[PDB]
Nucleic acid binder design. Structure first.
Lengths: 151, 51, 278, 117
RNA sequence: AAGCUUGAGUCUCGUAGAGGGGGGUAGAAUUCCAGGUGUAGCGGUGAAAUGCGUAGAGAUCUGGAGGAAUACCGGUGGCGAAGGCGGCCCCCUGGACGAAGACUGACGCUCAGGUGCGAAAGCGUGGGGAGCAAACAGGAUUAGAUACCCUGGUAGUCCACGCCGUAAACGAUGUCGACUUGGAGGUUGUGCCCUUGAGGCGUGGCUUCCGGAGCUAACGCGUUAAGUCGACCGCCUGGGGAGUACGGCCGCAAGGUUAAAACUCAAAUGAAUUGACGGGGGCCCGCACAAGCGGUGGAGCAUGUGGUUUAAUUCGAUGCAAC
């Protein structure tokens, strides 16, 4: 994409929210290539998050994703093989994409029954800005605005 | 020279005026400058600049 | 050219020719035909006179046990003498490089420490200790002086019935020992067809000064490894594939070094050699 | 020696290193730290790091003199007039103004000429 | 044979300049040389290390020197014979325009010998030394290093002179002069328009390029010639063998200077095309990067191969591809 750069594809959302945020995100887990059954165990978590948010399942996500999402980043493409290190604004397609992924990437293969829990336990934590995913918002921005010496 | 640095202190915002100051003349004094290289020069003395 | 086929061993590389000492023992400076090419000094050859000039039209260079770039010099070298002194700087990798090679080649090193006499009580000892690393590793050390050409009999006897060779660096008195051995100086040096000599107690020796100030030759990775068999044993030590003899978790070879179960030098040398081919 | 809490950050950057003295504005020397005195004695001191730390290590240990206003008076061209100035302004100071200092050499002495490989 | 003057020459008068000798000198510095604070460094490098500092050094601050050394002068500016010339006086000085007649009145051109001067090392031979670098050396890697790499130094530099006469002492353009493209440029005099700043604007002399024809092989050059002329002076003679021996010579010497053969080859070159490589570069693309996602591989397991066994473990299997 050296000629014309890009985000994601064939995504599928919610028949109850229609939220893309939730769509690109529900999706992420797939590499099961079917969120005809993916989505379910995250809702138990987002439900426990729904409560934990004081909102619904939709907006259980929302809160935790807005914590999670980066507002800046540092970007690489390697111009000349060069070590890019200058602070940049994380593009939305990343904001979202990476963020959504980050939450999901923080409740993985584990040690006990039900992801429902596993997710639940990730979810509110990301709600509280002390999730893993939100800490990637709060680590990428730390590298930003403190290095600019190299090209 | 100065950029009223009240903040800046890594960068200096200076690359102008080297002709009796900084890297220009100061790198060429107690380091060797040869005579079997600007002996090219006689003929070659105006070409390698912007580069 | 043609002549009468006769056997000989190539006594010398006569530059342009090769000089062949016949089966009888008669040396004939011979030509070497466009037709033959697998010739080296030491080859048993069919050489023919003319109808001296000879011509060579058959050779016999037996199997590899040493090269430069990667091209056998001879054969029946059952022992490689890695002969050293410190000229003009030196390193443990350099002797080891030769050792790794001796080990690879399956030609016996007899590690000869020249200038033993030169080396003070401390120096001789230090050097012996170093010589010992290799020795411990399996490569016997013979203390000789380059100059004094000491331990000459133990060396000679090691030479008996076999062919030996002189390896090292800038006339590290290798040249000196060679002179003793011969009992005639044929080389000094200080800071693939060449010439061969025959031993009286049995066996032979091959020499060239050119070899002696050093550069080094092309090789492959496995050979370096062959240079160190203790690594095989370490390869088995972690995993059914031990990283790669070098660091990475579960590199036994590396561990064995960390332990000191292997000497460090072997690993180090493994690297100088490894890098050079690459 | 002296203080006025206004100082100078003499940065004595140096080829394989960078040595830094923070000095009172008035003079003295108040701290000093090097870059090849930020240990380093290799490509390491030939790092900016060498300086970063160099300056830093100087720049702290001059504030005994209360220094927190520095002009930076960049001297030396070692890998440390970034890192070192880093660690000079930002080293318990507000940098009050930057400058670089130089004269009209006319020398005497012969320096080296040795190499040719 | 006598004249001209016109060339020349000369004598009349601008103008710029790093030309010089010899020296005034200036202000900085290199370096010299020192503490304090300050503090462990400095230092260096491939990578380091010797070195050094730690003794306070370096740093930095504080002090001065030493002896040595002088940007932007830097403009196709300008000056020089060149070989070559820019830190500030003075001199001594060399060389030099435009603008003036004129006169002398051919004083013109060029040069083998010869000759002056002739970059540097060097050198003689002493200077010089505040300092550096052959040689020569520690560390120092490095294949080898004895290289890299680092920690130093006499000649000579750092000084005076003598002593080379060679320096790709090269557009490898000899001299001189004349003759041969438009164009668009430079400097430096000076003409002129309100001097329109001295200006604005001629013209010289001089500088740039392009600049034609031409030429050249061609490159290119192309009036800056690499284009037409002359004299003059000097050149080339296939390539090596050779600023060197013989030889002879200059030189203290270095060594120059000068100045070989056999031998040796059927060859030596310019420029040019069309090239492709470049420890080149300049430029883009591509699950190539990149941003992800997952994969392979690992365990257990396969399949093929390898390997081994096997009598065979049947031939065709190899980056990628055993598959």
């Amino acid at each position: 994409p050296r000629r014309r750069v890009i985000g994601q594809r064939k995504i599928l959302p919610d028949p109850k929210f229609g939220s893309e945020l939730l769509a690109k995100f529900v999706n992420i887990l797939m590499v099961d290539g079917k969120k005809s059954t993916a989505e379910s165990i995250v809702y138990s978590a987002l439900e426990t998050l729904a409560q934990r948010s004081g909102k619904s399942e939709l907006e259980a996500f929302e809160v935790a994703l807005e914590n999670v999402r980066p507002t800046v980043e540092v970007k690489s493409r390697r111009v000349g093989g060069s070590t890019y290190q200058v602070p940049v604004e994380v593009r939305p397609v990343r904001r979202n994409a990476l963020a959504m992924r980050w939450i999901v990437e923080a409740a993985r293969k584990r040690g006990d029954k039900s992801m429902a829990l596993r997710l639940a336990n990730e979810l509110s934590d990301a709600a509280e800005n002390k999730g893993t995913a939100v800490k990637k918002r709060e680590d990428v921005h730390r590298m930003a605005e403190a290095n600019k010496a190299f090209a | 020279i100065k950029v009223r640095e009240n903040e800046p202190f890594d960068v200096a915002l200076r690359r102008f005026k080297r002709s009796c100051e900084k890297a220009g003349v100061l790198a060429e004094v107690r380091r060797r400058e040869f005579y079997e290289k600007p002996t090219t020069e006689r003929k070659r003395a105006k070409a390698s600049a912007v580069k | 050219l043609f002549g009468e086929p006769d056997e000989g061993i190539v006594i010398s590389r006569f530059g342009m020719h090769a000089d062949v000492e016949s089966a009888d023992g008669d040396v004939h400076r011979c030509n070497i035909r466009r037709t033959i090419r697998s010739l080296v000094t030491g080859d048993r050859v069919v050489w023919r006179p003319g109808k001296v000039k000879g011509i060579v039209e058959a050779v016999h260079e037996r199997t590899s046990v040493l090269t430069r770039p990667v091209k056998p010099i001879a054969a029946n070298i059952d022992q490689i003498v890695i002969v050293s002194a410190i000229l003009p700087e030196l390193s443990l990798n350099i002797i080891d490089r030769y050792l790794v090679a001796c080990e690879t080649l399956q030609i016996e090193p007899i590690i000869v420490l020249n200038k033993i006499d030169l080396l003070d009580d401390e120096g001789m000892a230090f050097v012996n200790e170093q010589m010992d690393i290799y020795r411990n590793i399996g490569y016997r050390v013979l203390m000789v002086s380059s100059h004094t050409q000491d331990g000459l009999k133990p060396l000679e006897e090691a030479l008996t019935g076999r062919i030996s060779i002189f390896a090292g660096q800038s006339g590290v008195g290798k040249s000196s020992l060679l002179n003793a051995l011969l009992g005639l100086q044929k080389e000094i040096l200080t800071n693939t067809a060449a010439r061969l000599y025959h031993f009286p107690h049995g066996g032979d020796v091959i020499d060239s000064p050119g070899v002696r100030e050093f550069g080094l030759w092309h090789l492959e990775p496995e050979q370096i490894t062959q240079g160190f068999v203790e690594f095989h044993d370490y390869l088995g030590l972690c995993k059914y594939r031990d990283c790669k003899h070098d660091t990475d978790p579960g590199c036994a070879i590396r561990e064995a070094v960390e332990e000191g179960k292997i000497a460090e030098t072997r690993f180090e040398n493994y690297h100088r050699i490894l890098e050079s081919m690459a | 020696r002296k203080q006025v809490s206004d100082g100078v950050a003499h940065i004595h950057a140096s080829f394989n290193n960078t040595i830094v003295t923070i000095t009172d504005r008035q003079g003295n020397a108040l701290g000093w730290a090097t870059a090849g005195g930020s240990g380093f004695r290799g490509s390491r001191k030939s790092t900016p790091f060498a300086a970063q730390v160099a300056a830093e290590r100087c720049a702290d240990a001059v504030k005994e003199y209360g220094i927190k206003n520095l002009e930076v008076m960049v001297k030396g061209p070692g890998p440390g007039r970034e890192s070192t100035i880093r660690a000079l302004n930002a080293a318990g100071f507000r940098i009050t103004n930057i400058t670089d200092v130089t004269p009209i050499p006319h020398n005497g002495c012969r320096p080296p000429k040795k190499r040719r490989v």
